[PDB]
Symmetry: D2
Subunit: 456 residues, 4 copies
């Protein structure tokens, strides 16, 4: 069978292919080839523009334009030609070199310096810079924007539900109340920490030959400062320089990048699960779309579930790459090549999940009635504030007395109030206690939500 | 950009797409829909054949033939129709139900009972049996044949190199000799153990309604023994019955299946690495093809790229296989839907493995043992004869053997030492007759006896 | 600070030390040394009993008894002596060899053949058989008994709660009813499958010299059939023979063993989480002990801490078990020594599991089903009867059943709907007679039939 | 059997117990209890010193000293008493509270405010700050110092072996040369990047009650700014403040801390493996200790192997904690409690490995003779520089000609020189080529080593 979204083995290009189309121009074989061509062309241009390298004279405006067009217009047909050349070479980067030599053969000025294409380079000089550009593009244009949407989404929920009381659950059991909004705010804050971290991760690149010592460069041009040339080239591409490497860029920064993405994904899994649970408890209802089919009565939180499942898959891939890539035998073994063709896979599962969560979030409808009704059936949670007040005014064995009263026992409002009336506390504090309810015993939850904007 | 092999995000459908084409008819959404159709059709057929279910009379030969053609000829076009319907329902199994109702509308016999399509079934009754069929098909038609190729490949190398001596390396250091063949035989034996295990793994399936108690079935047909009906149906599909489940089949067998595949893959990683090293030591050279380029900048290179490709994909395969094995069997209460999207990846872990198996086989086809180097290295490591000398000395009670050797080298040297030993000439001769190259123990016979085990 | 339960870095030897004391005589360094001694002793005993090995005459009854006592009475003191010797050799197995030579020096019969202790053996010949004995002992005496306790525990809960109805939750939402007992039976069935599997896992052992070819053995005793000698020895220890290995036993069976334990643990995590949730929903209350404190600040709390402790340790157990399973079977060439230190952790993964099993059993002992809540919740979810109504309507050809229900609730309501259906009174009555509480399908009978399967 | 290093189930407290003794006073149950007592005492002292909280008057010098002594002298006997109290409570932090109330009963000024011990606190307020102090102590006093030793060790090797030629291996095959020192330098640089990152990881702490909203605090003292009180307290302990949490500190920073440790461990695994290989190739010999026993002839790199094995174990634990800890049901489930008792386990395996590598490094003895001899048998590596020079001076099909000459062929010095003599290149460049050898074709390797000090 020919490949189509229906026949694709992986759902990243299959069922959810439409959800990750942006990655097709980045992490696919076409994307890799597109970036490699960009790097190869920029290298030749630097050689030409470098005065000390006279064998490659400065290019005329038309030649530079022709080279820039090769880069800018790089097409699927172009990639197919490279793939056809690779049939012969069984070496993908050599095929890219030959492809560029073909494209250039018709331009005298360019054909004349044809043998300077890939001059002194090792395949990894091209590959690592391509990987850097792929990751930087994905982070800056795709990953961070979804993260910002998720953060803003969570913040909107926090504000929207800032004062809606919630019977908290610790160890799964009814506990000291909070607000739906505060619970959303905690998540936004954690996501923001990771956002900052991902944005600060260094994206490294190198260019130094076969094993990292500019051997071939120096052999031919011993008068050129290749170490400086390298730093200038990598930085000219918008990549940070990694001066010490073997044949490969060591990949530590990819682990750094993927580790932070996995941490964010982990926070999201925690979120997907919590919301699934709030929905299970009927604290939220879900909007329904006419014609759709959810047992004819059910409305399932499938969006959060789809996200949760894909986040687990995403992390499985990202962490394998993070832990396996930085280990390469001696000056390098080639096991990382095929693995690096999966940079987009881990990211793809994540993107699918981000969109699913956003879709699920858009359907949320808070059930204030149930939230309040549940709270009203759990007056035992007032045992904490009562005992804490007792401790303040020196009443003996406060925690112990409240434990005897509520642990494993059902106590309604009248029973809790009956207990308060029997305490030897100042009249004022006595009334203050009888005035609280599980619904209003929310501490600083609301102000906490309102102050979120002052952080980060 | 539109999806194509060149633009595919995953290399399983991209660069290596042509290496896993068989999986496109199994684990893809087309494959899932195809098997779902098979299951729905067989379910209706069983209802018809069941005499106690009079509302679905037995089907005549032509109608059965029409239903069988729906199953056997299921096309991408049919799959596309289901996807079109799903755009309305936002429910894939329900779309399959509607697709079938549409397909049988022209046959009055079938159209008359179209409402019994999916009767009393919950979506997972259809999904789990589809996953079982997908995994069974993959195992019997795809995975096991590659494993047999690898095993036979290794056995061929064992036989071919049965008597080629090798300076063994323990802790990476020169050690007691073996033969290339024996080292290959060790791998084939391990692969065979896993082969037998994968073949013995149970592939489970269930059918019992919404939460596993046949509630709906019993409500409409309380006189029918649905528990028996369930067992017969699952077994009729060639799947083993799992009588106790919630809404979902628990997935324990998927972990069992994936665990054995991962163990085999680990054995293969060990092989890819060891051979990579034998090539590094120049114990093996590799066949080359004119026109091919070993390296872009070092023209003299011939790299073991096939083994490295294999090794890399095996690590990836295991990472995915392991995640599915550990995550799938945990589902909240009577089930949460996180396993649905995850099960669309059953073929991903398998795909990386298939790619690796083909790469290893390609690497194996290029190996050219280098006897000259193997023998020359052995001839410069006579120190390995310290072991047999020490053991013989011990047999005859010579004091401090381990010490006299550990303390105290070429042939002449080792020859001088032996001569000065208090041993009978016959034994001295036997020791003076051995060389690193022939101090291979039972290596050759071990290879010849391999065929006698599994 | 000196090591004690309070200062131990790992909680397996620290806080939970008393929960895994049986493992201290198995997987610890004392345990490893103990088994190494057993193996070395049995090896010497076999040499003696072998008629072709005349340099080691058959041992008389008292000497055999002295050797057996060395094995059976091995103490921490003996272990300490070995460690003292190891300070000189920086080689643990060699220290064991010296320890034994010291121990038999007083018996002339044994002292006369002390040089044959460890004859022709490589350290791993001793280590692998020790690991096999350690794992077999752990499986048969420790792991399987806890698994039987869990399984029987779950079966007891299934029987005890066989007819207690439950509002099932799929995707966390109210769904077709089941019974608490049936949900427990599902778990016991899954645990049983893994129990049978762990019991069937092969525990392999080998003995064949430096690199697996009996080089040293054949050099000294070329007339002895060491391949036969090897098989007899390993099987005499109650271990299954692995005829093809390098210096090390490949460790594939350890992965097989750990994979089944991890699958069982995963089933248990699923159980710990589900029960945690049933307690959260108040379907179960928990027994309390006077004096105990549920929470430091919320006096009303009764937390499912036993299940949570279990769940946490199971995740840890699997992480370690999985690392050993995937890492141990890969060893450079004829072996690298990275597996040595790693195998000192065989008991770590197992220890976390044991702690978890005990915590779950403790949690189970405190459960008190809350029928009142379970029934009250069911009585507020009549919408679940939409399923059976729809299926009956379908049986009798009423058009658009799924639609009339999906589109269109308490008892009276559901009762009004049914009354307006074109069905025979007999069927209307059957539908009007069901309630969420009794719409449990075959749940009860499924529980009663469990005993009939495995 | 009683617990001893011989009977311990885990080798962290068993065979290698002596290698991690520093962790016994930090991550063990004693350490956890020691830190909890510290936090509890500091909290009571802040309450007393806070003017607005009159029910807890400023403490006299002797009272403060008595409290400080409880903290400073905390002993194993003290921990045992807590463990004995825990027999009753089946709640470890409540036992700590009761323990402190007992210690204080004999001091009137302190006994008088006994019920303010643990005032308004939830167990996690004590636990998370204890975890923060444990990790900060381990990082600053134990982890970073071993990392510095490893970095300095690698740098010493780089300088020591700066000009020793090495036949590089890419894909395991002979390639463009480098120097032993340069290969060591690459590793030091990578380790330094992680060192910087670990040192910059935030160690977070919080204190805000049952579910994170100061409910109990505000119930008793609505006039006190508890949000400010919280920030002051956490910072007073030398911990960075985390203002938004549920009952638990979310643990994202632990994942951040462990992710960087795992990356460092991964670089070390790569190092242990590479050295194992250099030793296999006889590029290094190993020093031997009289009396020790290594087949009587062998000397095995057991130190690097022991390290490699423990690094894998370390990462297995660290990453499980990193990925599992930040996911907690609703306002928290208690599965993290038992897991956090293993913070020292992952670190312990790492420490064992660091010491093993250092031990192995101390035994290294470079084999210059073999390194040079091997290089002299691989003149084919000069194909790269020859073709690159040919490309410079416009000689047609340079790479192709060298490929025909060397790929899959054995070419000695005379053969390579014979080829150079036949090239149409300027006399000067012709001699330059005939002057190079595999041993001197090391590019910028030496200067690269010498310039390492200018980075970081
Ligand atoms: O400048 C060079 O090329 C230097 C060279 N090392 C290599 N570096 C990068 N790529 C290389 C290398 N070698 C091969 N190849 C080619 O990489 C392609 C790999 O295929 P895949 O496993 O499918 O990802 C596939 O096309 C391989 O042929 C060396 O000899 O060290
Ligand atoms: O038998 C039933 O359908 C009842 C049902 N539960 C379900 N079981 C199985 N599939 C279901 C279920 N619910 C939805 N869906 C549909 O599954 C699809 C999930 O899509 P994806 O996340 O992309 O894998 C997507 O098409 C979903 O609509 C329940 O509510 O208990
Ligand atoms: O049969 C032999 O001993 C020969 C041998 N290989 C070895 N096989 C097994 N153990 C060996 C080996 N070598 C050392 N050792 C000793 O193992 C111990 C390793 O200590 P640890 O890393 O703490 O687990 C530690 O005590 C080590 O000294 C070889 O060189 O091929
Ligand atoms: O302020 C509180 O205590 C509040 C409370 N939550 C808890 N937070 C922290 N620890 C708690 C909690 N609950 C129990 N425990 C006790 O923790 C101890 C856990 O044991 P282990 O599994 O061995 O690590 C063990 O001693 C447990 O009893 C809540 O109800 O949410």
């Amino acid at each position: 069978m020919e490949l189509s979204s229906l026949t694709a083995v992986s759902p990243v290009d299959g069922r959810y292919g439409d959800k990750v189309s942006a990655l097709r121009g980045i992490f696919s074989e076409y994307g890799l080839l597109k970036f490699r061509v960009q790097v190869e062309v920029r290298w030749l241009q630097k050689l030409a523009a470098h005065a000390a390298i006279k064998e490659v004279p400065a290019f005329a405006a038309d030649a530079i334009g022709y080279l820039d067009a090769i880069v800018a217009s790089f097409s699927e047909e172009d990639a197919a030609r490279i793939k056809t050349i690779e049939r012969t070479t069984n070496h993908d980067v050599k095929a890219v070199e030959y492809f560029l030599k073909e494209k250039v053969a018709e331009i005298p000025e360019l054909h004349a310096v044809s043998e300077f294409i890939h001059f002194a380079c090792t395949s990894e000089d091209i590959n690592n810079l391509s990987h850097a550009l792929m990751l930087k593009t994905a982070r800056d244009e795709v990953i961070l924007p979804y993260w910002r949407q998720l953060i803003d989404g969570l913040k909107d929920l926090a504000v929207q539900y800032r004062d809606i009381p919630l019977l908290s659950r610790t160890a799964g059991q009814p506990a000291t109340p909070s607000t739906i909004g505060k619970e959303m705010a905690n998540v936004a804050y954690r996501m923001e920490r990771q956002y900052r971290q991902l944005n600060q991760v260094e994206i490294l690149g190198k260019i130094n030959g076969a094993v990292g010592n500019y051997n071939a460069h120096i052999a031919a041009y011993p008068e050129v400062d290749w170490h400086q040339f390298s730093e200038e080239f990598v930085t000219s591409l918008g990549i940070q320089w990694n001066p010490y490497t073997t044949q490969i860029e060591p990949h530590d920064y990819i682990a750094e990048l993927f580790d932070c993405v996995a941490r964010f994904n982990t926070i999201l899994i925690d979120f997907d699960r919590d919301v699934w649970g709030y929905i299970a408890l009927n604290h939220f209802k879900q909007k329904t779309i006419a014609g759709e089919i959810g047992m004819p009565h059910k409305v399932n939180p499938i969006d959060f579930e789809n996200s949760e499942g894909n986040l687990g898959l995403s992390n499985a891939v990202l962490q394998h790459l993070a832990s396996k890539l930085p280990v390469s035998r001696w000056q390098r073994d080639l096991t990382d090549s095929t693995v690096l063709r999966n940079l987009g896979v881990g990211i793809g599962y994540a993107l699918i999940a981000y969109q699913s969560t956003l879709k699920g979030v858009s359907k949320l409808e808070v059930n204030r009635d149930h939230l309040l009704d549940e709270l009203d059936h759990n007056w035992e949670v007032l045992a904490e504030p009562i005992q804490t007040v007792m401790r303040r005014y020196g009443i003996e064995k406060p925690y112990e007395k409240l434990k005897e009263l509520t642990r494993g026992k059902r106590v309604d409002a009248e029973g809790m109030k009956q207990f308060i009336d029997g305490l030897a506390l100042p009249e004022e504090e006595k009334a203050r206690l009888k005035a609280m309810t599980p619904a209003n015993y929310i501490g600083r939850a609301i102000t906490m939500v309102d102050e979120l904007k002052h952080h980060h």
